[PDB]
Design an enzyme around this catalytic site. Structure first.
Site, short mmCIF file in Angstrom:
data_model
loop_
_atom_site.label_atom_id
_atom_site.label_comp_id
_atom_site.label_asym_id
_atom_site.label_seq_id
_atom_site.Cartn_x
_atom_site.Cartn_y
_atom_site.Cartn_z
N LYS A 9 0.82 -1.20 0.00
CA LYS A 9 0.00 0.00 0.00
C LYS A 9 0.86 1.26 0.00
O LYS A 9 2.07 1.19 0.26
CB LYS A 9 -0.92 -0.02 1.22
CG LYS A 9 -1.93 -1.11 1.21
CD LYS A 9 -2.78 -1.05 2.46
CE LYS A 9 -3.94 -2.04 2.40
NZ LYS A 9 -4.85 -1.89 3.55
N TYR A 27 -12.64 -1.83 -3.40
CA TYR A 27 -13.13 -1.64 -2.05
C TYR A 27 -14.67 -1.56 -1.97
O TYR A 27 -15.23 -1.10 -0.95
CB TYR A 27 -12.46 -0.42 -1.40
CG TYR A 27 -11.07 -0.73 -0.88
CD1 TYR A 27 -10.85 -1.85 -0.09
CD2 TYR A 27 -9.97 0.08 -1.19
CE1 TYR A 27 -9.59 -2.16 0.39
CE2 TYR A 27 -8.69 -0.22 -0.71
CZ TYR A 27 -8.51 -1.35 0.08
OH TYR A 27 -7.29 -1.68 0.56
N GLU A 38 -9.94 -10.39 -7.25
CA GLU A 38 -8.94 -9.36 -7.19
C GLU A 38 -7.85 -9.55 -8.24
O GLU A 38 -7.47 -8.61 -8.93
CB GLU A 38 -8.37 -9.24 -5.79
CG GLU A 38 -9.36 -8.62 -4.83
CD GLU A 38 -8.94 -8.79 -3.40
OE1 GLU A 38 -7.84 -9.35 -3.15
OE2 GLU A 38 -9.70 -8.35 -2.51
N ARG A 63 2.51 -6.63 9.37
CA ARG A 63 1.77 -5.58 10.03
C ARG A 63 2.26 -5.40 11.47
O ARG A 63 2.39 -4.24 11.95
CB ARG A 63 0.25 -5.82 9.89
CG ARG A 63 -0.15 -6.00 8.44
CD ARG A 63 -1.47 -5.40 8.02
NE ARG A 63 -2.52 -6.37 8.17
CZ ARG A 63 -3.47 -6.65 7.29
NH1 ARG A 63 -3.59 -6.02 6.11
NH2 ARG A 63 -4.32 -7.62 7.62
N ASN A 107 -1.82 0.13 7.18
CA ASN A 107 -1.34 -1.17 7.61
C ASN A 107 -0.55 -1.94 6.55
O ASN A 107 -0.59 -3.19 6.49
CB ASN A 107 -2.52 -1.99 8.15
CG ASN A 107 -3.60 -2.27 7.10
OD1 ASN A 107 -3.54 -1.76 5.97
ND2 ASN A 107 -4.59 -3.05 7.49
N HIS A 154 -2.14 -5.29 1.56
CA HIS A 154 -3.43 -5.93 1.44
C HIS A 154 -3.21 -7.35 0.97
O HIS A 154 -2.35 -7.57 0.14
CB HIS A 154 -4.32 -5.21 0.43
CG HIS A 154 -5.46 -6.06 -0.04
ND1 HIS A 154 -6.68 -6.09 0.61
CD2 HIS A 154 -5.55 -6.96 -1.04
CE1 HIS A 154 -7.47 -6.97 0.03
NE2 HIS A 154 -6.81 -7.51 -0.98
#
Lengths: 149, 149, 149
Positions: B9, B49, B126, B102, B112, B115
């Site tokens: 991320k 999302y 995905e 994490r 965090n 993903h």
């Protein structure tokens, strides 16, 4: 923003693990805001640990913590007290999760690498006992906007 | 062989942690089979999302994921979906086991690090959403006979 | 002082992780007291794994452990058996805690990087089976006074 007191103990210092332990604190997103290598005077040791004065191990704990320099820290971040405790791991390194400082680096309860304040209240006490206002800096960091929202 | 979609991320990207995170994925035995640095278009973010459209945090999620490039991945290995979730750790970095991505690297739920697909079906969804088949390579690797029986 | 038998398995050897695994053992405070890179003779494999002589997975165990060299170890320290099991992690790398050797490095039960003795009894047993008295050294180390009281 929340602050806690951390201290790299003389076992870590004498095992040459200072940088490694800082690295783990740093990479977690905690901001080093105060820090000094120092010989711990006897009374600082006794007042820092007196909760334990009565207990059998007491005189060993005082001898150990004054046996060589420690690296005293103030560390800042959202939920910093619990975060620190989390990455430090359980008091007993054989219970501490692998991946935690005590889980990866320590063997025994008495020689467990690092100290972290156990609560918000003892954090403000410990920070106050070990540091003066002027030894604790305040600064924005580039990553701040990426740690939090 | 099973595949999952991972994404480093923008927080990790902006904290310069790309290599570190790939290293943890790599050393676990998972095979990087697709990978691209990319700016996330608004639509991709919204359909990725989608489940969260109604929730208070939704806009923040969409702004955050589109704020700087991400590193999008397809990873392959026996039980890859679960394996990834295991080494990534709990959604909340303060609950995530020390030693997990994490647990070692993140502070907050919203920031965090990475993903990972939460299931087999959302993995294929995905993977399909982020990659075209021609972007996903297949190849034997020397260690394959040593990871599995 | 307590001792246990550890063995870096051929998957770890063939994945070039020998140093990495030794580092994890070493940094925990455990003292390497015997160590040898060796091809495992069929004879040793069968007696080492003799508990499992009836089971489906037995032949695979014997094939795998003789398929390339292993690094055999005697490791010393307070509570060494349980300390090793703790940093090694659960038999199944997908159950092993992140931060443990198996949790970070392995994928499958059959290819799980390292063995450690499950108890004091079988430590004693394995140490004897794999090493001769004269292959196991005894020595003080600088850090010993800093691991223990």
């Amino acid at each position: 923003m929340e602050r806690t007191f951390l201290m790299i103990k003389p076992d870590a210092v004498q095992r040459n693990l200072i940088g490694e332990v800082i690295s783990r604190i740093e990479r977690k997103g905690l901001k080093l805001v105060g820090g000094k290598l120092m010989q711990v005077p006897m009374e600082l040791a006794e007042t820092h640990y007196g909760e334990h004065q009565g207990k059998p191990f007491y005189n060993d704990l005082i001898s150990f913590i004054t046996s060589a320099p420690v690296f005293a820290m103030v560390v800042e971040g959202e939920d910093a007290v619990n975060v620190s405790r989390h990455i430090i791991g359980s008091t007993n390194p054989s219970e501490a999760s692998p991946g935690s400082i005590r889980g990866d680096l320590g063997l025994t309860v008495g020689r467990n690498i690092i100290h972290g304040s156990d609560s918000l209240e003892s954090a403000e006490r410990e920070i106050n006992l070990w540091f003066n206002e002027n030894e604790i800096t305040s600064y924005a960091s580039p990553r701040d906007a990426w740690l939090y929202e």
